[PDB]
Design a protein around this ligand. Structure first.
Ligand SMILES: [Cu+]
Length: 105
Protein backbone atom coordinates (compact mmCIF):
# COMPACT_ATOMS: atom_id res chain seq x y z
CA UNK A 1 0.00 0.00 0.00
CA UNK A 2 1.13 3.56 -0.78
CA UNK A 3 0.12 6.38 1.57
CA UNK A 4 0.19 9.95 0.31
CA UNK A 5 1.13 12.68 2.82
CA UNK A 6 0.44 16.22 1.67
CA UNK A 7 2.92 18.91 2.69
CA UNK A 8 0.84 21.98 3.59
CA UNK A 9 -2.94 21.83 4.21
CA UNK A 10 -5.28 23.19 1.49
CA UNK A 11 -5.86 26.18 3.78
CA UNK A 12 -2.10 26.86 3.84
CA UNK A 13 -1.56 25.66 7.40
CA UNK A 14 1.93 24.22 7.90
CA UNK A 15 0.90 20.61 8.48
CA UNK A 16 1.65 17.19 7.12
CA UNK A 17 -1.68 15.62 6.16
CA UNK A 18 -2.24 13.02 7.49
CA UNK A 19 0.32 13.64 10.25
CA UNK A 20 0.19 10.06 11.55
CA UNK A 21 0.43 7.04 9.27
CA UNK A 22 0.68 3.35 10.19
CA UNK A 23 2.45 1.12 7.69
CA UNK A 24 3.12 -2.55 7.27
CA UNK A 25 6.25 -4.17 5.83
CA UNK A 26 6.66 -3.24 2.15
CA UNK A 27 4.36 -0.21 2.23
CA UNK A 28 5.41 3.16 0.78
CA UNK A 29 4.91 6.66 2.18
CA UNK A 30 5.02 9.39 -0.42
CA UNK A 31 5.25 13.07 0.60
CA UNK A 32 3.96 15.57 -1.93
CA UNK A 33 4.15 19.39 -1.89
CA UNK A 34 0.59 20.69 -1.64
CA UNK A 35 0.58 24.30 -0.35
CA UNK A 36 3.13 27.03 0.51
CA UNK A 37 6.47 25.35 -0.30
CA UNK A 38 9.29 24.94 0.43
CA UNK A 39 9.06 22.09 2.90
CA UNK A 40 11.49 19.33 3.77
CA UNK A 41 11.41 16.04 5.70
CA UNK A 42 13.86 15.54 8.58
CA UNK A 43 13.68 12.49 10.78
CA UNK A 44 14.49 13.16 14.43
CA UNK A 45 17.48 10.93 15.25
CA UNK A 46 16.38 10.70 18.92
CA UNK A 47 12.90 9.47 17.84
CA UNK A 48 13.52 6.65 15.40
CA UNK A 49 14.34 3.05 16.39
CA UNK A 50 17.71 2.74 18.13
CA UNK A 51 17.80 6.53 18.27
CA UNK A 52 20.08 6.10 15.23
CA UNK A 53 21.49 9.14 13.47
CA UNK A 54 22.47 6.97 10.53
CA UNK A 55 18.89 5.75 10.13
CA UNK A 56 17.45 9.26 10.50
CA UNK A 57 19.91 10.64 7.95
CA UNK A 58 19.10 7.75 5.54
CA UNK A 59 15.39 8.52 5.67
CA UNK A 60 15.56 12.32 5.55
CA UNK A 61 15.09 14.53 2.53
CA UNK A 62 17.04 17.52 3.85
CA UNK A 63 17.05 19.46 0.57
CA UNK A 64 14.23 22.00 0.50
CA UNK A 65 11.44 21.04 -1.91
CA UNK A 66 10.30 24.18 -3.76
CA UNK A 67 8.28 22.85 -6.67
CA UNK A 68 4.51 22.39 -6.67
CA UNK A 69 3.73 18.68 -6.34
CA UNK A 70 7.43 17.77 -5.74
CA UNK A 71 7.55 14.33 -4.07
CA UNK A 72 9.75 12.18 -1.92
CA UNK A 73 9.06 8.60 -0.92
CA UNK A 74 10.22 5.84 1.39
CA UNK A 75 9.40 2.15 1.01
CA UNK A 76 9.47 0.55 4.48
CA UNK A 77 11.18 -2.78 3.65
CA UNK A 78 13.37 -5.00 5.86
CA UNK A 79 16.27 -2.55 6.45
CA UNK A 80 13.76 -0.43 8.45
CA UNK A 81 13.10 -1.74 12.00
CA UNK A 82 9.63 -1.84 13.60
CA UNK A 83 8.70 1.16 15.70
CA UNK A 84 7.78 4.80 15.41
CA UNK A 85 9.62 7.39 13.32
CA UNK A 86 9.01 11.06 14.16
CA UNK A 87 9.84 13.69 11.54
CA UNK A 88 9.45 17.39 10.95
CA UNK A 89 9.75 20.14 8.36
CA UNK A 90 12.71 22.41 9.19
CA UNK A 91 11.13 25.57 7.74
CA UNK A 92 7.99 25.11 9.83
CA UNK A 93 9.25 23.14 12.82
CA UNK A 94 8.50 26.07 15.16
CA UNK A 95 4.88 26.12 13.98
CA UNK A 96 4.46 22.39 14.64
CA UNK A 97 4.82 20.93 11.12
CA UNK A 98 5.56 17.42 12.42
CA UNK A 99 4.52 13.85 11.63
CA UNK A 100 4.95 10.27 12.76
CA UNK A 101 5.17 6.98 10.85
CA UNK A 102 4.41 3.81 12.85
CA UNK A 103 6.05 0.73 11.27
CA UNK A 104 4.19 -2.38 12.42
CA UNK A 105 5.72 -5.82 12.96
CU1 LIG B 1 6.88 22.79 5.96
Amino acid sequence: ETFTVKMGADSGLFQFEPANVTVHPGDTVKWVNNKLPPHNILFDDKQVPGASKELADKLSHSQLMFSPGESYEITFSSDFPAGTYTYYCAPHRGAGMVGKITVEG
